Amino acid sequence: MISLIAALAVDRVIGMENAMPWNLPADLAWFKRNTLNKPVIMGRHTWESIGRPLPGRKNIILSSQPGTDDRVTWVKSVDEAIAACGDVPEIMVIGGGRVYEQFLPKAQKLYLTHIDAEVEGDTHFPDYEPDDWESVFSEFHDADAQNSHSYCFEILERR
Ligand SMILES: NC(=O)c1ccc[n+]([C@@H]2O[C@H](COP(=O)([O-])OP(=O)(O)OC[C@H]3O[C@@H](n4cnc5c(N)ncnc54)[C@H](OP(=O)(O)O)[C@@H]3O)[C@@H](O)[C@H]2O)c1
Ligand SMILES: Nc1nc(=O)c2nc(CNc3ccc(C(=O)N[C@@H](CCC(=O)O)C(=O)O)cc3)cnc2[nH]1
Ligand SMILES: [Mn+2]
Ligand SMILES: [Mn+2]
Ligand SMILES: [Mn+2]
Ligand SMILES: [Mn+2]
C-alpha cells in the first residue's frame, strides 16, 4: 500500500524556494510518528531540502542521475522506488510536488495537515478529486505557544 504525507498551507502551497518557511513542531512530530519504521520515498529536491537522512526509516531518493551519498538508496523510476521498498505493509511518499503528482494515482491513503497560514510558494500539492477520497480521521488544533498557526490533521482513504 502506498500513502502520501504532506503539510499544506492555504491554496495547497507546500514549499517556496526549496524550503518550508513555517515552523510547526506538532506537525513534525505527527510526520515522525506516521513515518518511523517505514520506507520513505522522496524526490531529489526534497532530499536537498531536508539535508540529511531521516533516522529509523529506509530513505529512497528518486533522481535521474547517479546518487551522491551511500547513506540512502538511489533509484531512477517510480517502479524501481516501489521495488526497493520490499514487501512492507505501507510505503510513505514524502514529496515534493513532482513526486506527489506521480504517486497520487497509486495511493490508497493521504495523511494531510492543513495549516491556516498564507504562504507565497512555488510548489503545490496536486489537485485531488475530492469524490475519490473518504475522510476517516480529522483532528483540529488551535495555535499555541509552540505552534503559531492552527492546523488540522486529516487521514483520507481512497473510496
Ligand atoms: N509541505 C510538505 O509537505 C512538503 C513535502 C515535501 C517537499 N516539500 C517542498 O517541496 C519542494 C520540492 O518539490 P519539487 O516538486 O521541486 O521537487 P521533488 O519532487 O522533491 O524532486 C523532483 C526531482 O526528483 C527527481 N524525480 C522525480 N520523479 C522522478 C522519476 N520518475 N524518475 C527519476 N527522477 C525523478 C528528479 O531529480 P533529478 O533532477 O535529479 O532527475 C526531479 O528533479 C520544496 O520546496 C520542499 O520544501 C514540501
Ligand atoms: N505533515 C508533514 N509535515 C512536514 O513537515 C512534512 N515534511 C516533509 C518533507 N520535509 C521534511 C523536513 C524535515 C523533517 C524532519 O526534521 N523530521 C524529523 C522531525 C522529528 C520531530 O520533530 O519530532 C523526523 O525525524 O521525522 C521531515 C520532513 C514531508 N511531509 C511532511 N508532512
Ligand atoms: Mn520502467
Ligand atoms: Mn514483493
Ligand atoms: Mn489544506
Ligand atoms: Mn495563520
Structural resolution in Å:
1.3
For the chain, what is the domain count?
A: 1
- Give dist(CA 57, CA 39) in Å, integer: 5
CA quadruple 32, 37, 39, 40: dihedral, nearest 10: 10
Give the residues surrounding ligand 2 with Cβ less than 6 Å away: 5-7, 27-32, 46, 50, 54, 94-95, 113
- 35: Cβ below 6 Å to ligand 1? no
- For residue 138, give the C-alpha cell: 480529522
What residues have CB less than 8 Å from 62, skipping those under 6 apart? 41, 42, 43, 44, 75, 76, 77, 78, 81, 99
**Annotated binding-site ranges:** 5, 7, 13-19, 27, 45-46, 52, 57, 63-64, 76, 95-102, 113
Task: Output the residue whose Cα is nearest ligand 2's atom 10.
Answer: 50
Give the Cα separation of 56 and 90 in Å (integer). Answer: 15
User: How many angstroms separate the CA atoms of 100 and 81, rounded?
Assistant: 13
Atom number, ligand 2, closest to the C-alpha of residue 28: 22
Question: d(Cα 134, Cα 156) in Å, to the nearest integer?
Answer: 5
Q: Which domain holds residue 79?
A: 1-159
Instruction: Evaluate the CA torsion angle 158, 91, 55, 12 in order and state its sign.
Output: negative
Ligand sitting nearest the alpha carbon of 82 = 4
